[PDB]
Assembly symmetry: C2
């Protein structure tokens, strides 16, 4: 398969600006060779020069020793790093960390062990992408093995860690845990739909309890995996963004300027929410118009919603592009803060685009449906319709995806690399966002359509292999990054859960018929809070394997790290002391 | 003053059981001398034999070195412990830690550096108390200096730390911070009482915001003080209780037995709540009876409440004694868990005894006052009365305390020690509980009587010296214990704050006149939650001196701890690489 190539650099050279392009190429070559990297140059499609780079095991051993020293410094590696640059790796050299360290060597600034060739900030305006190569032998075996199973063991996630790093492995572990936890809502939602009719209050409590239990158990599993993979606490390592444009040095950026460009979110968010509300109001007005005076064969009534969801991927993509443009123009020093801000913006936009139609149907039309008269007479109150609407939503994605699916020398290695270079980087945040949106649907609107949980369970089982296929075939190999958790998405999940405990409950009051609505909302929220406290208390006192491992390591370290003068001169010893004590009690 | 005496042991010997009393005395002497402690024996009042104990600086240096090694092991001391048993203390040997280590030497089990002489568990059934001696020269100076000031600097709290250890210093720092923070509620409560009439909703929001801001800022100050005093993270050091009665060893106790004896709280709590509710209902029925058909001069109407509060210290003391008896009979291994359980029981009982009368007046009588007819016709609806009632409560304590106040050789050293031995150990949990009760009053019922905050501010200023006088004169010197926070009391405070944000708001709706009440309660609770989130976010991004110190220590530590073969053999160097690259772009 691969010829030992460890990284690939694109370095587009156009027909124009060739004179400085050659200088950039030679400078890149000296910068790469100074670090101690073996390099090769080959053709690429459309005037590109692919550069193949590997490591001299002594230099790599020294670099991994320095990296382990740095990890020990920040507390993410409690055990001793190693003896010396000698053979102490008999601590494996697994491909994920090797590729991450080689990428750091390639892209780190010249100040600290590297030669910065970042393709956006510095004069490296000609390099397009720096990516590792895919292992087809491993990829085909992984795809075949995952498709031949029904449940994935922890060893599969460990192999994903070993090959693609911490972020991809964490996403796959989260998806596996969420899919396994989706069985309970599927089972009891099928039970409620079979027996309890529709809009079951007990179903709302069960869904909220499942949501909080799953959230807390996933936090416990997250810390377990973080201490198992040796990446616990890596979030404290704040790495600077190369594209950070600073002003002075004491690098620093005026916080007031960042606040000023952050305030641009409010007009952007307001414009997006107003446009989306207008679109959804028009769509639902047309829906009630066709459901009022028209003929079907029934199913055609909710067709505007079907069209809205079929068109919503494009609107969501445009909004995500705008959010990314806004995030790029608003400077962030660390990459963690930039990623958190981008995740927050994308989560808000997707929250709007995916839930505002249901929110308008439930808490706007149902309580007072007499506000649609202007639109209704421009073209010219069912309580259960939301259920049907929710059903369409909860099936729209899966069904349309299915529809799409139905519609449908060393020259070979060089051609494979050239084909791979045209692919796009794998963005795990998109998959995280789609899973978070599905969880929000489950915790928010499953009361209307209790069967939604089974459909999402089937979709999750399909996605556990669909995303694997996307990574293996449809995407170039991502850079192995280290993270101790799924990031800020946890917060989003928590938020959804909390507000879910409101919305679903309110639905049960609104679609089954004021002071009663407020009582139901407050009782559901307080039940959610008390079960959150109870589950946190239960899991806190529960013994985790990571805690036992940490305690064993601490015990091993402990095993390895192991007047006044006249008053006091009366009875200077011990014999006189108890002699005088015996006579002393003898006096009484 | 003192003759170098560092600890005192009582060791009561009755007229009976003298034969084994002498054996216990001699065994205590050998156990104390084996550790390496100089001992003296003198008379005491009522057949007691006072034993005076000090340390041989080499043994004490070795013990403090071992203690610092243990502190380094658990992470509470990040810096290196010391070079060796040599003179590395030039790390002071301040009296608090010296006394704590000597007490550990006296009371630790023989397994790990000590000779267990605990006065309750083992055969040491004759020793009554082991306590250090008071420093009258320091005590009088401290009392005079604190009474001559208006505000206490951080240096006074540092001196309290140096003399009486972490717990007393933490309590005094908490009381100082709470008294300083009480200025804002006093000021704006006086403003509301002067201008906004009574039962001001804006006052409820201001009080809730102050409560959450004070709670979060006190958490920040707590971590600051914990890292300043070098006791950050000492809560993880779980020390076993000597009075723990175990069954097997693998020490272990059956958790089911502990759960069985813990279930006895439910009948105890129910009986206490029923009796207290009956007493308060009878008192308020008599109150409305005299306010209905009787003659005063007005002020005599609330006399039953005055009598109830004057009598409530005795009932509270009986309940605390019962709770302590229940806690003792229900085994706990660590002292932290035992203290937390005792604090929880005492907090629940005092919560009942101090708030249930106001709760019945506000949320029971006011909404429906037609349930008191049975009592009313046994003896035989004002909205603002609660305010008056609250006023009486908020002044009852201070006023009655004031009333009480108004009503009102080396033989000298031996007599001083004998007089001191008759005193009682200082229980900081009682002062913590009274401060927590006052804070609960402020956050809960200040809407009825906005002037309560000023009275509590004056009472806090008085108490900051009254508790100092109680410790200095009216109590024997407490053993210096280490704690990184005020303990579980924080949780109690948080709880009060949350429910305060309900109760006060409900009062504003109930005493100013349903769905509106529920709307007000939910809006107030959500406002409390959002301001909690905002304050947590603001303080999280704020820079603390402790974080800077930890980062500087980490930086100092870092400064101190500092086929494939044919494919890859084409251009083995750098010169050929850019030569072939130049010709390579020359080909196109
Ligand atoms: C339409 C409704 C949108 C609700 C927005 C809720 C956003 C929840 C997700 C927000 C998020 O993930 O990022 C957090 C930002 O802090 C926030 O939450 C502030 C969000 C402000 C709400 C706008 C940082 O998380 P961290 O891990 O750093 O802690
Ligand atoms: C419909 C409302 C839309 C406005 C959203 C207001 C801002 C919502 C803030 C959302 C947020 O970040 O808090 C989450 C949980 O909140 C909660 O438990 C409840 C707070 C909800 C705020 C009440 C509105 C995370 O929790 P935490 O990061 O603290 O861990
Ligand atoms: C009449 C109403 C009484 C309300 C009781 C609220 C008690 C709040 C104070 C309870 C407390 O301080 O102890 C906590 C016990 O865990 C609890 O809270 C459980 C309390 C159960 C409520 C009964 C442990 O705190 P930690 O620092 O260990 O975390
Ligand atoms: C009047 C109600 C009486 C019943 C009390 C039920 C048990 C109350 C539990 C009290 C408790 O420990 O939670 C506190 C805050 O709770 C809260 O933020 C709100 C929870 C209130 C529970 C709703 C009732 C501490 O917070 P945390 O230790 O998590 O930090």
């Amino acid at each position: 398969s691969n010829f030992g190539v460890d990284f690939v650099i694109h370095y587009k050279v156009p027909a124009a600006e060739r004179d400085e392009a050659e200088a950039g190429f030679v400078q890149l070559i000296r910068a790469l060779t100074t670090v101690g990297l073996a390099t090769e140059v080959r053709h690429g499609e459309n005037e590109s020069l692919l550069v193949f780079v590997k490591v001299s095991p002594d230099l790599f051993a020294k670099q991994v020793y320095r990296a382990r020293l740095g990890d020990w410094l920040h507390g993410v590696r409690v055990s001793a790093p190693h003896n010396d640059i000698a053979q102490a790796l008999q601590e494996p050299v697994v491909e994920a960390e090797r590729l991450r360290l080689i990428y750091l060597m390639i892209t780190k600034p010249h100040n600290e062990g590297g030669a910065g060739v970042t393709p956006t900030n510095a004069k490296w305006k000609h390099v397009e992408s720096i990516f590792p190569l895919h292992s087809h032998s491993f990829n085909k075996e992984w795809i075949k093995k995952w498709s031949s199973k029904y449940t994935l063991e922890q060893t599969d996630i460990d192999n994903i860690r070993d090959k693609f790093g911490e972020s991809v492995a964490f996403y796959f572990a989260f998806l596996r845990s969420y899919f396994r936890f989706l069985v309970i809502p599927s089972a009891f939602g099928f039970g409620a739909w079979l027996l309890l009719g529709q809009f079951s209050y007990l179903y709302a409590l069960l869904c909220g309890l499942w949501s909080v239990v799953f959230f807390e158990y996933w936090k416990k599993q997250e810390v377990d995996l973080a201490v198992q993979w040796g990446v616990r606490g890596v979030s404290s390592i704040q790495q600077s963004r190369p594209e950070f444009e600073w002003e002075h040095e004491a690098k620093v950026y005026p916080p007031m300027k960042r606040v000023k460009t952050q305030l641009l979110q409010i007009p952007f968010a307001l414009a997006c929410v107003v446009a989306l509300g207008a679109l959804i109001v028009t769509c639902n007005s047309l829906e009630v118009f066709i459901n009022e005076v028209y003929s079907g064969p029934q199913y055609l009534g909710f067709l505007p919603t079907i069209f809205l969801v079929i068109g919503t991927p494009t609107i969501s993509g445009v909004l995500m592009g705008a959010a990314e443009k806004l995030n790029a123009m608003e400077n962030y020093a660390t990459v963690d803060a930039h990623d958190a801000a981008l995740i927050q913006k994308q989560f808000v936009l997707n929250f709007m685009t995916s839930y505002m139609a249901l929110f308008f149907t439930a808490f706007v039309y149902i309580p007072f449906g007499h506000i649609l008269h202007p639109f209704l007479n421009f073209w010219r109150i069912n309580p259960a319709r939301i259920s049907n609407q929710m059903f369409y939503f909860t099936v729209t994605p899966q069904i349309v995806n299915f529809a799409t699916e139905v519609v449908v020398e060393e020259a070979e290695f060089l051609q494979r690399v050239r084909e791979e270079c045209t692919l796009e980087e794998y963005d795990v945040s998109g998959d995280y966002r789609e899973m978070v949106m599905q969880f929000g649907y489950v915790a928010m609107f499953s009361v209307a359509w209790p069967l939604a949980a089974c459909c999402f369970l089937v979709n999750n089982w399909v996605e556990l292999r669909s995303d694997a296929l996307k990574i293996a075939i449809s995407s170039r190999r991502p850079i192995p990054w280290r993270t101790d958790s799924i990031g800020p998405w946890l917060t989003a999940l928590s938020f959804l859960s909390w507000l879910g405990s409101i919305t679903s409950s309110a639905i049960v009051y609104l679609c089954s018929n004021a002071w009663g609505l407020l009582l139901s909302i407050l009782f559901a929220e307080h039940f959610y809070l008390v079960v959150q406290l109870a589950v946190r208390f239960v899991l806190s006192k529960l013994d985790s394997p990571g805690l036992q491992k940490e305690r064993k390591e601490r015990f091993q370290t402990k095993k390895r790290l192991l007047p006044e003068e006249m008053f006091w001169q009366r009875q200077r010893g011990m014999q006189e002391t108890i002699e005088i004590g015996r006579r002393m009690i003898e006096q009484q």
